[PDB]
Paper text:
The [name] geometry provides spatial separation of the two paratopes sufficient to allow for simultaneous binding of two targets to the same Fab fragment when desired.
An L-side binder for VEGFA and an H-side binder for [name]-BB were paired to result in an initial bispecific [name] (clone VP), with a variable region amino acid sequence as shown in Supplementary Fig. S1. Following independent affinity maturation of the L-side and H-side paratopes, the most potent paratope sequences were combined into a matured bispecific [name] (clone VP mat), with a variable region amino acid sequence as shown in Supplementary Fig. S1. A more than 10,000-fold increase in [name]-BB potency was obtained, improving the IC50 from 21 nM to 1.4 pM. Calculating solvent accessible surface areas both in presence and absence of the respective antigens yielded a water-excluded paratope size of approximately 430 Å2 for the VEGFA-121 dimer on the L-side paratope and approximately 292 Å2 of the [name]-BB dimer on the H-side paratope. Experimentally, high-affinity co-binding of both targets to the same [name] molecule was confirmed by surface plasmon resonance (SPR). The tight binding of the VEGF-[name] [name] to each of its two targets was achieved by using only three CDRs per target.
Residue numbers in the entry:
A (entry chain CCC): 7 to 101
B (entry chain HHH), E (entry chain AAA): 1 to 189, 197 to 216
C (entry chain LLL): 1 to 189, 191 to 209
D (entry chain DDD): 7 to 102
F (entry chain BBB): 1 to 189, 193 to 210
The structure:
């Protein structure tokens, strides 16, 4: 027997972001990345008022080091690479 | 279920005027008729009025047609009740409610006290355990919330960490024109949290043999 | 308006009983009726609507019936937590109109109170008033008589009692009575409270 | 600037599920729902070993009541409606 | 950075045999050559051997060609070192490392002790403050970890809630054939956490005056 | 193999100094060399690789150079937290080969130890043994002489000392010395420190 639904409020929530090919190299997508994905903070959730989307008031940029593993034809190469993560830190319902 | 929370009530001199607001979680508010219902202390429920979906129409109980205006804000999801030329008759808890014929959603209500008597916060005294109270494996203790006006006064024990063993008596109106209330708790042989919104009094009184 | 006439105004009923509350309208209503339960202090909870429809989460025992002018709430197997005040509401025509209400008490075996007495706080006698409190714990039925006595003297007038609503399981009442005195008068004189109740062979007293 | 990247582990994480039209009524979906979305638990995250996807070991079904608000070509109608939520409670890295 | 954790070390009788494993967070392990490097107590670093990307090839330091086999599990991301006919020469910390010419990622290492001597856990005695330790506006206390074998013994204070004021001395090998170590802390005028993996001893010893 | 010859074997250097460590190979290496720093107890940390490339997160002051046979680590402005042992590693040909290492001590103003003494635990004398401990706290340089005699003359042989590695900021040493006795011998009947930072030998004792 059912119970009463609670709205997902507009706040920052831990999400999983996958680190794609295009973020380091479009021209040659014949390589890999470690780790393959990282945690981030994003705004998500619904708004109580009509015609207000949940959106971020404050975004933090956070650069992070990963490894690019190029299959250089037959042989692995390990390069370091930095990627910049966009973290949301606060949310507001806005028009 | 759906939330509603009334505010705007308190103490008001006779002949005075007052606005009540009732706020609703959620945009659902914009899609429903909304009624107000009142109820005087120790008396029956009395419909006050309603307002239609889009604001299209307003409807009132005859006893009230002159004095009250229902107004609605579809953005804030707030319902409003404008009250003028108030008298002792109007001392009541006023409810917000979701009108669909049959009122399936209620606020908790807001107490309007119509009176030309001074606001005053309570003094909190301890009812301390002894021979008298320790009686048997269990003992009785409490606090006396004295000489306040108007109602209401909420009481918690150790901020809600002691819930079940409580007995909060309705306040009695003293000959003075002020209210006095007792809250007691049973424990095996200890702070009451007193909140008196109208006077912005909040007291945390330790009770000690 | 249409006048709602609920009956009866009040009643006691033992745990388990079947109970019927009746609502009668001045015109034909066509099931534009609903039933509310309302605990002491609290907002009304909708039980039946459209005459006979139960609301989600309303126990099976609550039952709506009626047609035309005459309508009925039936509580089939009365539970101690059913103590409340019940209302009907017409909504066939504006204005909406309710009944005057039915105050339901649960009725049970006699139980006598436990009696405790509280001296006034020294911290309160600093303010120069003395308030003495007598506590009757978990009894039935409601009717009791507290009487204050300082030395041999029945104190007449300066006592005030308040009584809890019925317990949700235990269906007992609890009562507090407050004798108020000037600090001076208090310091003048033993203090006692003498309880009279059907569940007592003869009057119990508590004093210091 | 930089600092060292941490893998998103395979575990249950709070997500926001929107309650769609198709879940109560496809037939000309001319109506609304409250609340419009609810929190859920889902598995997400990457796996340390090669060729292991992150997947749920234990899913809990959780029915919840909402309201359906039908614009009845003019006038709102408020019906109650239940929807069943699929919550993940544990995850494991499992083979392809 | 990338993680590596060696295990498989401990105490081993001479002539005996032993397998070390070194585990790596992450599938990156499958895409790199991997080396082992050793280092005897109070001596220099010595390459042990390496293994190629796909397993294609193995490579060893001559001193070791007879005795050691490097093996690799590309599923578990584990590197393995098989060691036979061990002697005192082999008592060392053994490192796992990421071979790309230049070893940019290291395990912490695993201590192999080659000896035909009895494992034994420590007795923990208090070095208590008084007069001579209260010295300045500052006092000296500690615990003595005595008669253990083999190395190593880790020490924490109040489970890591006291970190900075610590001084953990290297153990001295007694004439007995057992190790004894002292850890001391400075505090203004208190439990050491002793962990001795090889004997599955863990002690929490309070020190007081 | 190719033999790596690091120099010098060991050295002291004052805070701020420029320091050079040199590594020489038996064959021409072509920058297939790297430099490691390694603190006491811990794994090696890669500093320079490919002869001259700094690793991400390695301070600016560490500097790689060399060609052919001869290679150099240069620490430009020596910091107290640079105390370590440094190694070079060839990787032009298998087998990989390292240098014998350079143990770097930070050198600083003389500082004399604070001396504390510990009786044996009664709880330890319950077992067969009495162990007495003398503590020298935060001194420089390393060289000190502890000598035992407790309600007694000179105990010769039954003492053992251990010494911390240098402090990461303060660059001092700390030392513990343990005289061991039978419970009996203990019940039958001081530690005397000699150090350049002392006018004359300090003693600490209980009786």
């Amino acid at each position: 027997i059912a119970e009463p639904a609670m709205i997902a409020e507009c706040k920052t929530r831990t999400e999983v972001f996958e680190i794609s090919r295009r973020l380091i190299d479009r021209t040659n997508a014949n390589f890999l990345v470690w780790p393959p994905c990282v945690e981030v903070q994003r705004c998500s959730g619904c708004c109580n008022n009509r015609n207000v989307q949940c959106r971020p008031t404050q975004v933090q940029l956070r650069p992070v080091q990963v490894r690019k593993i190029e299959i250089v034809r037959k042989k692995p190469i390990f390069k370091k690479a930095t990627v910049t993560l966009e973290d949301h830190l606060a949310c507001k319902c806005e028009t | 279920d759906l939330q509603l929370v009334e505010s705007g009530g308190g103490l008001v001199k006779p002949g005075g005027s007052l606005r009540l607001s009732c706020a609703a979680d959620g945009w659902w508010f914009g899609y429903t008729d909304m009624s107000w219902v009142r109820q005087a202390p120790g008396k029956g429920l009395e419909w006050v009025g309603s307002i239609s979906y889009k604001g299209g129409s307003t409807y009132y109980n005859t006893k009230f047609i002159g004095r009250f205006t229902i107004s609605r804000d579809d953005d804030t999801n707030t319902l409003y009740l404008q009250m003028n030329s108030l008298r002792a008759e109007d001392t009541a808890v006023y409810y917000c409610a979701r009108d669909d014929g049959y009122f399936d959603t209620w606020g908790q209500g807001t107490l309007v006290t119509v009176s030309s008597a001074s606001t005053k916060g309570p003094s909190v005294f301890p009812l301390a355990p002894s021979s008298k109270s320790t009686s048997g494996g269990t003992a009785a203790l409490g606090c006396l919330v004295k000489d306040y006006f108007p109602e209401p006064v909420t009481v918690s024990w150790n901020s809600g960490a002691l819930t079940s063993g409580v007995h909060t008596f309705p306040a009695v109106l003293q000959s003075s024109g002020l209210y006095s209330l007792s809250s007691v708790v049973t424990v095996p042989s200890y702070i009451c949290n007193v909140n008196h919104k109208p006077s912005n009094t909040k007291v945390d009184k330790k009770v000690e043999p | 308006a249409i006048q709602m006439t609920q009956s009866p105004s009040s009643l006691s009923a033992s745990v388990g009983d079947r109970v019927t509350i009746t609502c009668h309208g001045s015109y034909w209503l066509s099931n534009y009726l609903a039933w509310y339960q309302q605990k002491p202090g609290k907002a009304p909870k909708l039980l039946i609507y459209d005459g006979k429809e139960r609301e989600h989460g309303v126990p099976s025992r609550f039952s709506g019936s009626g047609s035309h002018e005459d309508y009925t709430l039936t509580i089939s197997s009365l539970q101690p937590e059913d103590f409340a005040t019940y209302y009907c509401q017409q909504y066939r025509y504006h204005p909406y109109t309710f009944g005057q209400g039915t105050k339901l008490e649960i009725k049970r075996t006699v139980a006598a109170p436990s009696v405790f007495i509280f001296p006034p706080s020294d911290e309160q006698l600093k303010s120069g008033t003395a308030s003495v409190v007598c506590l009757l714990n978990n009894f039935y039925p409601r009717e009791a008589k507290v009487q204050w006595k300082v030395d041999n003297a029945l104190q007449s007038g300066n006592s005030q009692e308040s009584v809890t609503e019925q317990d949700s399981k235990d269906s007992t009442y609890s009562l507090s009575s407050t004798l108020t005195l000037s600090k001076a008068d208090y310091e003048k004189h033993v203090y006692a409270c003498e309880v009279t109740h059907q569940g007592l062979s003869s009057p119990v007293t508590k004093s210091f």
